[PDB]
Amino acid sequence: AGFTDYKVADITLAAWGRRELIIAESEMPALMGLRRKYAGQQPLKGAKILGCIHMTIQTGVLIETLVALGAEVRWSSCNIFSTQDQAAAAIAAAGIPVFAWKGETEEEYEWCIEQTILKDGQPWDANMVLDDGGDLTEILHKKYPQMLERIHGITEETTTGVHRLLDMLKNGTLKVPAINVNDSVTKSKNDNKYGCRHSLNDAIKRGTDHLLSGKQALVIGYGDVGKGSSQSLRQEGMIVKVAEVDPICAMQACMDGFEVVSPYKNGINDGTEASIDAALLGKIDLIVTTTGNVNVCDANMLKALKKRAVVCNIGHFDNEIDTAFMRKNWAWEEVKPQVHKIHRTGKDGFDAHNDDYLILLAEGRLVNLGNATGHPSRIMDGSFANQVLAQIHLFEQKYADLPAAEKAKRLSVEVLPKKLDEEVALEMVKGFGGVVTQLTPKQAEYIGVSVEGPFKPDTYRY
Amino acid sequence: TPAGFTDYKVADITLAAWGRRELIIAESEMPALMGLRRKYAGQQPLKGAKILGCIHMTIQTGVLIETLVALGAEVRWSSCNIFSTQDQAAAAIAAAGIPVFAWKGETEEEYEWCIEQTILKDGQPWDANMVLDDGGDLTEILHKKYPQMLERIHGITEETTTGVHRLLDMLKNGTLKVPAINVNDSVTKSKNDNKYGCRHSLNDAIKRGTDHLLSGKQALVIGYGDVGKGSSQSLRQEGMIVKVAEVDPICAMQACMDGFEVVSPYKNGINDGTEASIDAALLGKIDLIVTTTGNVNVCDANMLKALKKRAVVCNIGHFDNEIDTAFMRKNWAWEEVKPQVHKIHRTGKDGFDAHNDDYLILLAEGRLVNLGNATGHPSRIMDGSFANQVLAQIHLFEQKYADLPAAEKAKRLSVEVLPKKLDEEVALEMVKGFGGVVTQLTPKQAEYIGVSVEGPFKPDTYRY
Amino acid sequence: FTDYKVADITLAAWGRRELIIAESEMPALMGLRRKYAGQQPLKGAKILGCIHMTIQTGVLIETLVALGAEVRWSSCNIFSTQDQAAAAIAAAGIPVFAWKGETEEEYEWCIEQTILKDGQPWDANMVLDDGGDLTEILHKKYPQMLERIHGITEETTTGVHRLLDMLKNGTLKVPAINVNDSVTKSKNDNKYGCRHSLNDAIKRGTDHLLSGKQALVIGYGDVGKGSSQSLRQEGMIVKVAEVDPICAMQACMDGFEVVSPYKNGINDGTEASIDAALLGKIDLIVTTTGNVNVCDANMLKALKKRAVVCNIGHFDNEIDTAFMRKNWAWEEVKPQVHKIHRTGKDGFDAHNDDYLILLAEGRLVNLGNATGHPSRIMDGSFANQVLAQIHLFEQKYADLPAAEKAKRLSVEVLPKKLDEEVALEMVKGFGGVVTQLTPKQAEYIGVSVEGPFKPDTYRY
Amino acid sequence: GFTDYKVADITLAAWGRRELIIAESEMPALMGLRRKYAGQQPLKGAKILGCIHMTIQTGVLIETLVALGAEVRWSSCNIFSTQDQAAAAIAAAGIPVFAWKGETEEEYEWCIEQTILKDGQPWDANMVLDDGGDLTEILHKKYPQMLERIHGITEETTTGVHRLLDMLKNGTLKVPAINVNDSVTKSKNDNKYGCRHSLNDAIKRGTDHLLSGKQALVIGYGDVGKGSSQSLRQEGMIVKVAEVDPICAMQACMDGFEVVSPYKNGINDGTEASIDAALLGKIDLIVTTTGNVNVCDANMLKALKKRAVVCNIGHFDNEIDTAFMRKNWAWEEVKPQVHKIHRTGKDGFDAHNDDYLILLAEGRLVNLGNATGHPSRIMDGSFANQVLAQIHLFEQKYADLPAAEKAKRLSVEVLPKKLDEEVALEMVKGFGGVVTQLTPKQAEYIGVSVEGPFKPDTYRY
Ligand SMILES: NC(=O)c1ccc[n+]([C@@H]2O[C@H](COP(=O)([O-])OP(=O)(O)OC[C@H]3O[C@@H](n4cnc5c(N)ncnc54)[C@H](O)[C@@H]3O)[C@@H](O)[C@H]2O)c1
Ligand SMILES: NC(=O)c1ccc[n+]([C@@H]2O[C@H](COP(=O)([O-])OP(=O)(O)OC[C@H]3O[C@@H](n4cnc5c(N)ncnc54)[C@H](O)[C@@H]3O)[C@@H](O)[C@H]2O)c1
Ligand SMILES: NC(=O)c1ccc[n+]([C@@H]2O[C@H](COP(=O)([O-])OP(=O)(O)OC[C@H]3O[C@@H](n4cnc5c(N)ncnc54)[C@H](O)[C@@H]3O)[C@@H](O)[C@H]2O)c1
Ligand SMILES: NC(=O)c1ccc[n+]([C@@H]2O[C@H](COP(=O)([O-])OP(=O)(O)OC[C@H]3O[C@@H](n4cnc5c(N)ncnc54)[C@H](O)[C@@H]3O)[C@@H](O)[C@H]2O)c1
Ligand SMILES: Nc1ncnc2[nH]cnc12
Ligand SMILES: Nc1ncnc2[nH]cnc12
Ligand SMILES: [K+]
Ligand SMILES: [K+]
Ligand SMILES: [K+]
Ligand SMILES: [K+]
């Protein structure tokens, strides 16, 4: 009532968004357990959180948990295609500043992040950051250093964002401490892997409605996202080949039942067309990049792909695929939003019945969020319970108020303790109806642990 | 065979030719190990090493033994389990003039005698200076009964989770006398051997022991670590309906996401020692229970009383105390079907009716079932484990801890893992063995993610 | 051109883009276009068609037209139309009456608009049907039109069941081809199509994680087999119910636990017969039977809170949705997704936790909440349809003397040789390479080198 | 003083008996028939010549026939498939059996002849149980006067049925037969899931090879090829499938397999030039499943990747051209039923040669040659059908019919669906499965009786 501090696609989608939020709450027991456990204590009272992460229904439940624990927030999406417009509407209709819609331009994307940083044309009195991929973190460091003086910490969601934080820490340019939320086991080995198992084939079906069984796929990378992606396709009956630069991850792909190949003859990427294994790429119906690296589906690979192959990226940024080359050289025919046929016949127009085209999903942006709805609530429950715990921890540490000498001892990128990781996992397991066994005192003593945990040394890899 | 060689004890020396044929096949299945043989043979990095070895005397261990010897070592060998020796592998090693004391079906007394035969040569302590162990039994005997021998030993290379646990306990209590390498926690060990090894060999052992159809039946896997993960997959891929029990909620979370129902043998998960705490309805529908924990009494007497008639019971953890077989020896009548396959008749202790329907089938008397009823992990998986063992032996032997002054010794008394660069090099040879082709990063790409083109490719915190 | 009714004609260009993609996914259908274009074997055929107005059906429609036919089309379900497909067909000048979200009355009206042209019966001479609704209406309300119709080609198990019942009772007026029972239909479409599209529909409707949750699939025929795999491959813990012990044996061997909603399998009508403990652990129930009331009122009362309920058999009476309309309050989440509040009939608490989620109001969930089977699977079914249309149209049943009609009034399947030819085109579409028998090998197993390769008894 | 048998070692009898008692608890359909029909003795007076793999599972079948009143004389239908402890247990029970693991071809024929003849003259046989048609063929060729008094043949397997239908078509079949193979509780149980269980079993026992990550080529995708492909894919193999039947090939594609041919463009012109050498040079394991001849031929064998495993799970060993390998290459026995075939020539071999293939069971049925064949709970279905088929044909008494009636009943037929469903129900109950009973309204709705049959005869499952 008099609330205008937002920008969304269509505020009238709010009722729909709220209905899906209420369903999502029943799917996110770890997050709702934190809401119930901490609402009375208000651990985030006084926290003012700049948040930049995909404005989905799942993020909505995270935002309202932070608010329920006392926080104020100003929110944007971390991708131009990942917002669910009904989720953004519901958050805006609840009186929460949010600047996010599906299908932003790059200019609008930056404008949305700035609308969270600035309130009434001046820096918001922010003191906490929640980021997914590091874009908000980067803009604060380059453009708003005086704001970082008063920020107690950053809680970063994803592998690519953690890499950018560690880069800054090594260079001595990180200004506030951070929690690497990504490397909780209930994040990395849940969200990154099983989330992509759920949502990769989901997005490919919604975009193309292609049968996947019996066709050939090439997954580039076999980390947590590549593992999940490869399973998303293999469980549908695809014949999946895996590329990797890490021989340990390649070994896992072999033992998991995949053939390990390289787009390049003998794996040597020398920049020439002659290095492309044209015979291999000429049989591939679907290529998925999962690396967080640059140009792993390059222009020569795109030229060699089988006609009518699907091309998509599920890593954080779109530069995994050389989409710039395709914009320069080939004609783009939009099938529907976030589905384009790329005609390799040339740049100036195309025959509507041309058979030499590729299908690109979400213009090379994160395909699970761009062409579907990303990971499901019950998986994001784990990631976002860690986010809430990470926000509570850094806000209580009050880094910004410490003397310079004490700041120097606390400026780091850390993970949550294993005990908290286990407590998140336990709520997830109970959500499935699973029953964890309790060690007897004898058994606890025998393996050298407390009955309540933690159950594994910090070196353990699961 | 060296003239007059008698410094060994095996079941049947006439099996040596068969063993040698299978060793030649296994060399072709173990490219990381044979690649170390080719790379290091000329340089002889283990010349002067005298290795006491205690690990399952299989064909795969045979290839490991002859690699150590090819690099210059002398060895004296025993198995780390009474049922895990393949007698044709022991025979081939003995016929090569290598002291080995190992046969399938040892008694517990013979098991200790075999280890002592490695430790003693001609009635006196051998001048050993290295130890390779799997489970910590050889390490324990040296520390407890031959402590002076450890004054000359440069290090221990320990194969398995349970053995490392024991070493870390000694380190924490100040009782470990020599440095050790935790071979288990190489990724090309723990996340290869422990998981995929059990995936290959668990259903293999159950089939050899019982020839039971597995599809459509109910299994309960106790544990979901690396061995529990592989064991659950071994059974699920055969079409079993697999339930998983865990005390670790993170491992239980993985089990749920992997498609398993997570249950406890006890109502509400609370194990209070009473029959009343047993979920009798659950245990009464289980056809197969497998323990994978490395913990004690995780398949207890009341569980055994409540199990479905004719359920199979087995253990793939390192030691047999995962199952309360002592209870079964005390109370129930054992009928041997064939070696390492026993019907345990719950009707009472003395006799049994030949056609009684109320029995359980116990495999390998509760000892490691994959080695006891089949042949353990396959050569191509053991390749990674044993490449790491060889690298760990070279590293500790070269450090010469026993030759250091006491000040320098205190700095190096530790339990370490091999560096990630070596882990990656093992994996690369494994991938090539499959015909896999690893892509090489461009310089720009290596710069982009902050690694060298040659690796390592992951920070040490990475969990794979 | 105004002889159509679709939701939004401006969707035509989008639909045409997707038809052009679909053509590249349907090599068996497109091969028929190339093979028979010169003969025009359907020249003079006027086909009443009643089947889900999807992109895939669009390619079928345009294949029939390319071979000479005229058609007038409706959907066979109120929720299965893809509006852009309907628009693309309408924009090409083809009469079609179909949109997503019809009422039952509009559904009936649409079929009647195919039957009637300018207020009078169209001079139809062929029928293509999926489920038997158009066949039933013609027999009961327009029996005179069947005097000019040469045959029916029926798509699906439930439609074939209805044809055989009419044949047994002597009420079927024209011959028919059972398209369902070609192997490239029944063992492709019914099984693998549901494998692809069941989890697809559940994800689009609810975006629920499926891994780790408990499913109960009622039935294990072809649709039940594909449905169970759709869920198991996502990591659901799937239990299977069956009345047929052979199908139940297949479920056991395929790795599923076989259970009944009723204690000891005995459905005596009482709440006491419900296995409440089992139903109280089920997160998702899917009915696949073609039977009536296999998810009944007492089962719905006993289901775990917030379980998903859906049906992928042809008709919605597999679930007792009528009970739920009478007794419980429905909250629309979005089209084809309703929360059903077991707290009462009049109103509901917006935060109530005691509800079920029903998809597509109990109608075919794969078509109602997603897009049904993928083009490359429907290629097989619809190539059989085209061949079956050609065969019955060439037989010219309606022109035969009454004495010769009696000898041809039957329900038949296509011959195996054609089944194999459709399959080969599908295999080639994957890049598969079939081996050719040597003369000696062909003699050894007693087949011709070109096939057929199996006796008619073979079950694959 | 029972001496009417020949087995490897009678002292294995106690061990065989122990495994028989276990197997009875895994075979509820078959033991259900034992309990249901024991008092009635429906096979009293039956005298059955039996020729099928002398396994523990066959032991339970034999003792079921005996318990129902039959006498029998038994042999194995393959030289490597006998389990010596099962043969010993049967002989120790006083049942004539002539079978051991590792027969020569000459001994194989002698064993069958020992069942046909008793004390040097034709036994008074009146029933035949066969697996593959070898006993059936010898009777028709060499003992026609015995067939005059025989009421029928019950034939287990696809290849045996093919030989029966050829005889029927040529007018040479002398007695009616039941095609046991094509019961759904046989063909879609035994042929498929039995090979799923036992193919990777036999490969592990023979070689202990890791299968995960390696390349397999399965020739054929019928029931045996389907189950074999699953046996390897579930272990993590990368499985390619070859087929001549496009419908079976379509199934392989949709099941998630790549469909390939050993020959370029699928055309076998008999020369090396037609072999896809790039494909075969990548294959770690080839398995033949066809029932056809020379589907893994000499030119394929020459092109296979070094150290590939070659095996056959169809009924006869001519699926692989082992004759070519015997004529040209040197064989090194690793252990029984496992040979290295050195492609360096025929005159000796280097013990460390790298260019060899591994042949399992000398090309004979690999699941039975290198392991124990199908598990008891699967053979339960097959052998319940066998017992019922024996009962049906013995009760018909074809040999006593007048010539005019014989002509009307000389056929090869399958058991009715009601029997197939009742076998399946006992298998399901063995897993603890609970089948739902239709209500009268539901049975009416789909047009079936509450007790079944639930499907028309056309249904393919
Ligand atoms: N879309 C989603 O929902 C989602 C979820 C989590 C993470 N992510 C993003 O996905 C990316 C990967 O995340 P992760 O956790 O899997 O990282 P990771 O480090 O676990 O895996 C990346 C893998 O790519 C491999 N790789 C690098 N360059 C390669 C090349 N040229 N060819 C082949 N393989 C190559 C690396 O060896 C590594 O194993 C990141 O950008 C992350 O932020 C996306
Ligand atoms: N047989 C083989 O070939 C083989 C191979 C490798 C290791 N091992 C042995 O197997 C054992 C397990 O090794 P690992 O690497 O999997 O160790 P691990 O630590 O990875 O896993 C053991 C798991 O057991 C769980 N657990 C403990 N007590 C439990 C209880 N009471 N109920 C349920 N779950 C319980 C723990 O939470 C843990 O996740 C060790 O003894 C190891 O030495 C055997
Ligand atoms: N949605 C789709 O895309 C699609 C595709 C093909 C067919 N269908 C429809 O799906 C239905 C099933 O087709 P089908 O080809 O699988 O038929 P089917 O005869 O192969 O299978 C139906 C199965 O249900 C079982 N069944 C019957 N009543 C039961 C009960 N009370 N409890 C448990 N099981 C019971 C039967 O035993 C049978 O095995 C039909 O209505 C058919 O028209 C839908
Ligand atoms: N080992 C066992 O336990 C066991 C069990 C059952 C049957 N069998 C035997 O296995 C064989 C197969 O039986 P089935 O029931 O699977 O028969 P089937 O007719 O169902 O399948 C055989 C398949 O081989 C294919 N084929 C034929 N020639 C081919 C070629 N040159 N290349 C590729 N594919 C080719 C056919 O198209 C067919 O689909 C028979 O000999 C049968 O008696 C063995
Ligand atoms: N649904 C989702 N919401 C927010 N962040 C995500 N990352 C992946 N899936 C997501
Ligand atoms: N996509 C589709 N089109 C037409 N009929 C169908 N039946 C199932 N899926 C279908
Ligand atoms: K979602
Ligand atoms: K082994
Ligand atoms: K579709
Ligand atoms: K067996």
Architecture (CATH level 2) of domain A194-374: 3-Layer(aba) Sandwich (3.40)
Neighbours of chain D (3+ CB pairs under 8 A): A, B, C
* The dihedral formed by the CA atoms of B252, B253, B256 and B257, expressed in degrees to the nearest 10: -140
- Please report, to the nearest 10 degrees, the dihedral formed by the alpha carbons of residues C138, C143, C145, C150 taken in order: 80
Q: Which of A141, A198, A343, A375 is catalytic?
A: A375
Q: What angle do CA B455, B461, B463 make, to 5 degrees?
A: 90
Radius of gyration of chain A (CA): 23
D190 is catalytic: yes
Structure tokens at A108: 């609008």
Say whether D258 and A213 touch across the interface (CB within 8 A). Answer: no
Record the tokens describing residue B119, joined without a space.
């430790």
Q: CB-based burial of residue D24 (10 Å sphere; 0-12 exposed, 13-18 middle, 19+ buried)?
A: buried
Calpha distance C258→D435 (Å, rounded):
7
| D319: nearest CA partner in chain C | C441
CB A192 near ligand 1, within 6 Å: yes
> Does the beta-carbon distance from D258 to A216 stay under 8 Å?
yes
CATH topology of domain C192-372: Rossmann fold (3.40.50)
Q: Given A102, A152, A187, A241, which residue is catalytic?
A: A187
- Tell me the three state secondary structure of residue A240: strand
Q: Is A76 exposed, middle or buried (0-12, 13-18, 19+ CB in 10 A)?
A: buried
Strands (E) in D313-355, as ranges, are 330-335, 338-342
Instruction: Kindly tell me the burial class for residue C370, based on how many C-beta atoms sit within 10 Å of its own C-beta (0-12, 13-18, 19 or more).
Output: buried
Give the integer Cα–Cα distance in Å for A150 and A49.
Answer: 12
Report the alpha-carbon distance of residue D426 to residue D258 in Å, rounded: 37
Give D429 to chain B, closest Cα distance, Å. Answer: 11
Closest alpha carbon within chain D to C457: D458
Residue of D71, D131, D362, D420 marked catalytic: D131
CB proximity list for D323: less than 8 A, separation 6 or greater: none
Neighbours of C170 (CB within 10 A): 8
Please give the torsion angle defined by the CA atoms of residues A78, A84, A85 and A89, in that order, rounded to the nearest 10 degrees: -90
Report CA Rg, chain D: 23
Q: Which residue has the tokens 């369902």?
A: C180
Method: X-ray
Q: Is residue B208 within 8 angstroms of chain D, CB to CB?
A: yes
**Nearest CA of chain D to the CA of A248: how many Å?**
14
Going by DSSP bridges, is the β-strand pair B50-54/B130-133 parallel, antiparallel, or unpaired?
parallel
B322 lines ligand 2 (CB under 6 A): no
CA distance linking residue A178 with residue A138, whole number of Å = 13
SS3 D178: strand
Query: Which amino acid makes up residue C122?
Result: W
Alpha helices by DSSP H, listed for B183-308, are 187-189, 198-210, 226-236, 249-257, 280-283, 301-306
Q: Give the whole-angstrom CA distance, residue C8 versus residue C12.
A: 8
Residue A290 three-state SS: coil
Q: Tokens 């090569």 appear where?
A: B96
Resolution in A: 1.7
Bridge-based pairing state of the strands D330-335 and D309-312: unpaired
Q: Which atom of ligand 4 has the smallest separation from the CA of D223? A: 16
User: Residue for token digits 């499965």?
Assistant: D433
* A387 among known catalytic residues: yes
Q: Assign a CATH topology to domain B196-376.
A: Rossmann fold (3.40.50)
Decide whether any atom of ligand 6 lies within 6 Å of the C54 Cβ. yes
Which residues on chain A are in Cβ contact (under 8 Å) with B253? Answer: 186, 190, 382, 425, 428-429
Burial of D409 (0-12, 13-18, 19+ CB in 10 A): middle
Helices (H), A51-184: 57-68, 85-93, 106-117, 135-143, 145-148, 159-170
**Which helix (H) or strand (E) element contains residue D351?**
none
Give yes or no: C56 in active site.
no
Show the tokens assigned to C125.
């001479």
CA-closest candidate to residue B60, choices B386, B391, B372, B388: B386
Find the A154 Cα to ligand 5 centroid distance in Å.
Answer: 18
Q: Does the beta carbon of A294 sit less than 6 angstroms from any atom of ligand 1?
A: no
C-alpha closest to that of A422 among A458, A376, A391: A458
**A237 labeled part of a ligand binding site:** no
Contact (CB, 8 A) for D126 and D149: yes
Q: What CA–CA distance (Å, rounded) separates A243 from A245?
A: 7
Asked, as a colleague might, if the bond just before B459 is cis with ω within 30 of 0, I would say no
CATH superfamily of C1-191+373-432: Adenosylhomocysteinase-like (3.40.50.1480)
Find chain D residues with C-beta within 8 A of C165's C-beta.
Answer: 447
Residues contacting residue B65 through CB under 8 Å, at least 6 positions apart: B53, B75, B77, B93, B98, B100
Q: Quick one: which atom of ligand 3 is closest to the CA of C193?
A: 3
> What number of CA atoms fall less than 13 Å from residue C29's CA on the CB side?
27
CATH architecture of B5-195+377-436: 3-Layer(aba) Sandwich (3.40)
A357 - beta bridge partners? A343
Residue type, A65: T
C-alpha distances out from residue A321 to A272, A296, A299, A362, D182, Å: 17, 6, 8, 12, 53
Longest CA pairwise span in chain D (Å): 76
Rounded to an integer, what distance in angstroms lies between the CA atom of residue C438 and that of residue C451?
Answer: 12
Catalytic one of A252, A371, A383, A386: A383
Could you tell me which of C119, C129, C135, C93 has the C-alpha nearest to residue C6? C93
The beta strand positions in C67-125, using DSSP E, are: 70-74, 96-97, 116-117, 120-121
Tell me how far apart the alpha carbons of residues A109 and A349 are, in angstroms, rounded to a whole number.
Answer: 29
Alpha helices for C169-280 (secondary structure H): 183-185, 194-206, 222-232, 245-253, 276-279
Q: What Å distances lie between residue C423 and A18, C188, C442, C456, CA to CA?
A: 48, 10, 20, 16
Sheet holding B218-222, edge to edge: B261-262, B241-245, B218-222, B288-291, B312-315, B359-363, B341-345, B333-338
Pair B227, B189: CB distance under 8 Å? no
Q: Does any ligand 6 atom lie closer than 6 A to the CB of residue C299? A: no
User: Are the folds of B5-195+377-436 and B196-376 the same?
Assistant: yes
| CB neighbour list of residue C443: distance below 8 Å, 6 or more residues apart | none
Residues A193, A197, A201: CA angle, nearest 5 degrees: 145
Residue C190 bears catalytic tag: yes
Q: State yes or no: cis peptide before D453, omega within 30 of 0.
A: yes
Q: Which amino acid is at A282?
A: G
Q: What is the atom index within ligand 5 of the atom nearest the CA of A158?
A: 7
Whether residue A296 is annotated as binding a ligand: the answer is no
D 141-170 residues inside an 8 A Cβ radius of C: 162, 166
- Report the C-alpha gap between A154 and A176 in whole angstroms: 7
Q: State the Cα angle at B312 between B306 and B316, rounded to 5°.
A: 110
| Whether domain D193-373 has CATH 3.40.50.720 | yes
Contact call for C427 and D187, based on CB within 8 A: no
If DSSP codes are grouped into helix, strand and coil, which group holds residue D156? coil
The total of other beta-carbon atoms located within 10 Å of residue A96's CB is 22
A185 vs B250, B256, B440: nearest CB: B250
Residue among A419, A432, A430 at smallest CA distance from A33: A430
Q: Give the angle subtended at the CA of B214 by the CAs of B210 and B218, to the nearest 5°.
A: 115
DSSP-assigned states of every residue in C111-129? HHHHHEETTEE----EEEE
Please give all residues whose beta carbon lies within 6 A of any atom in ligand 5, as ranges.
A 53-54, 56, 58-59, 195, 369, 373-375, 380
Strand B333-338 relative to strand A72-76: parallel, antiparallel, unpaired?
unpaired
Pick the CATH number of D2-192+374-433 from 3.40.50.2020, 2.60.40.1930, 3.40.605.10, 3.40.50.1480: 3.40.50.1480
For residues D8 and D336, is the Cβ–Cβ distance under 8 A?
no
Residues 6+ apart with CB under 8 A from C168: none
Identify which of A143, A138, A186 has the alpha carbon closest to the alpha carbon of residue A163.
A138
Q: Which helix (H) or strand (E) holds D61?
A: helix D56-67
Active site residue B127: no
CA distance B183 to B158: 6
- Cα B279 from Cα B270, distance rounded (Å): 10
Q: C220 labelled as ligand-binding?
A: yes
Q: From the CA of C371, which ligand is nearest?
A: 9
Q: Pocket residues for ligand 4 (CB within 6 Å)?
A: C 435, 437, 441, 453; D 157-159, 190-191, 194-195, 219-225, 242-245, 248, 289-292, 295, 313-315, 365, 367, 373-374
Which fold would CATH assign to domain A3-193+375-434? Answer: Rossmann fold (3.40.50)
Sorted by sequence, the CB contacts under 8 Å of residue B419 that are 6+ apart come out as B456
Nearest-ligand number for the alpha carbon of D55: 10
> Of the listed A131, A157, A318, A427, which one is catalytic?
A157
Residues 6+ apart with CB under 8 A from B91: B10, B11, B12, B13, B14, B15, B16, B18, B19
Checking DSSP bridges between strand B341-345 and strand B288-291, what pairing results, if any? unpaired
Residues B222/B223/B224/B225 CA torsion (nearest 10 deg)? -150
The CB density around residue C224, as the number of other CB atoms within 10 Å, is: 28
Each domain of chain D, given as residue ranges in start order, spans: 2-192+374-433, 193-373
